[PDB]
Design a protein around this ligand. Structure first.
Ligand SMILES: N[C@@H](CCC(=O)N[C@@H](CS(=O)(=O)O)C(=O)NCC(=O)O)C(=O)O
Ligand SMILES: N[C@@H](CCC(=O)N[C@@H](CS(=O)(=O)O)C(=O)NCC(=O)O)C(=O)O
Ligand SMILES: [Cu+2]
Ligand SMILES: [Cu+2]
Ligand SMILES: [Cu+2]
Ligand SMILES: [Cu+2]
Ligand SMILES: [Cu+2]
Ligand SMILES: [Cu+2]
Lengths: 214, 214
């Protein structure tokens, strides 16, 4: 069992949970109510300077950053699946897509949504266009392969499946992007028997409810 | 020879150049004047949807995102050096640090600097504190090892060496962070004989001059 400090609703935490459930990595869960500021306590901050979740403690091996935990868990406990290609030529593409998500797609989701979700800010028209612009890039990126970075399912699809599944929950109009919508369906049917509903569908809603609420 | 569409001053491009020079990967350079908008032309946008640099074309293998190019080049042409540890337990830490840089340290550098550098915006006091807060996290991260993610020099140090060397050029007060300053010296002496001055020192200045100018 690997320890994971997380928050169900958290998009980054859900990537880790899905993968873990998919490759059978048993998780000893520790909810960290970031809202009540539990991550700021001395002993967690001593554990992780940046005091964020998800944070993994795999038998002493501490590590954070959802996407780094994906590659890691997969290298440490993966099997017959190939959610993280050994061939570097292929792994590069998967890496590229995971960086795309962290530094572009998701970042822009957080920018147009979380503020209003954290302080009731007003939506920013310009900040919504940038998100659309990125979805556009992704749309172009979905042309080459059947999946997002390989012609088979990989951890990139998981990361990105969580970012887009959230966008969708926020009821963002994804009509302009049919490849994204098409790949999004595949990701759901692919994860359905691995806790998608239980883990990601229930999480996107509460997170969307908190956005629509206020 | 691997093709690289780049811009000398660009921090992401300089990571790639340093590594490449360090591990002897010959580069066929193609300057892309982003200022004049050359990256927006049809044939580059056809090459890279997100039309950004650095962009590598290694014998047909197209790929972008400076940090993904680092791991790649190192897996494709590395040698006696170990700038990217095979042991996954170790690679994780190096990955974590590269994500830290992309999604945190560097991102916050771009936020407090490039606007005024792109549109003469005024510096944001709050946005400068966040950068300080991240340097603080990094400072805590430099405790465990002699270098940033290993007890030996890796590609993380290169990525991060470029981000902090830029911060420094912007004359940011780094007095509060002695570990960062200490590691920063090691990185310079480490890269000095691999084009540091020629590649990164000359690049940080022009970029700083463009910030101080306006
Ligand atoms: N890039 C990180 C982002 C993680 C992150 O932002 N976590 C938030 C919570 S959530 O938005 O994902 O729900 C957090 O821990 N925030 C508290 C803190 O940073 O102190 C990842 O991919 O794991
Ligand atoms: N995360 C990317 C960022 C690259 C980036 O932002 N490149 C800029 C130029 S620079 O700021 O690095 O100099 C670019 O190509 N901009 C043009 C564009 O995005 O259209 C990386 O690490 O490579
Ligand atoms: Cu265990
Ligand atoms: Cu098509
Ligand atoms: Cu289910
Ligand atoms: Cu060649
Ligand atoms: Cu010390
Ligand atoms: Cu030199």
């Amino acid at each position: 069992t690997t320890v994971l400090y997380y928050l169900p609703a958290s998009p980054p935490c859900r990537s880790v949970l899905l993968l873990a459930k998919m490759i059978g990595v048993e998780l000893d869960l520790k909810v960290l109510n970031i809202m009540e500021g539990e991550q700021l306590k001395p002993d967690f901050v001593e554990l992780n300077p940046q005091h964020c979740i998800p944070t993994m403690d795999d038998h002493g091996l501490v590590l954070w950053e959802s996407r780094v935990i994906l590659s890691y868990l997969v290298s440490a406990y993966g099997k017959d699946e190939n959610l993280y290609p050994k061939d570097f030529r292929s792994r590069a593409i998967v890496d590229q897509r995971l960086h795309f998500d962290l530094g572009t797609l998701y970042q822009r989701v957080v920018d147009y949504y979380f503020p209003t979700i954290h302080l009731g800010a007003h939506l920013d028209q310009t900040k919504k266009a940038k998100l659309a612009e990125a979805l556009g890039w992704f749309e172009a990126m979905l042309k080459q392969y059947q999946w997002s970075a390989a012609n088979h399912f990989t951890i990139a699809d998981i990361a990105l499946c969580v970012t887009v599944s959230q966008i969708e929950a926020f009821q963002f109009d994804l009509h302009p992007y049919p490849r994204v919508r098409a790949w999004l369906l595949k990701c759901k049917d692919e994860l359905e028997g691995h806790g998608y509903k239980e883990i990601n569908e229930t999480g996107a809603e509460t997170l969307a409810g908190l956005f629509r609420s206020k």
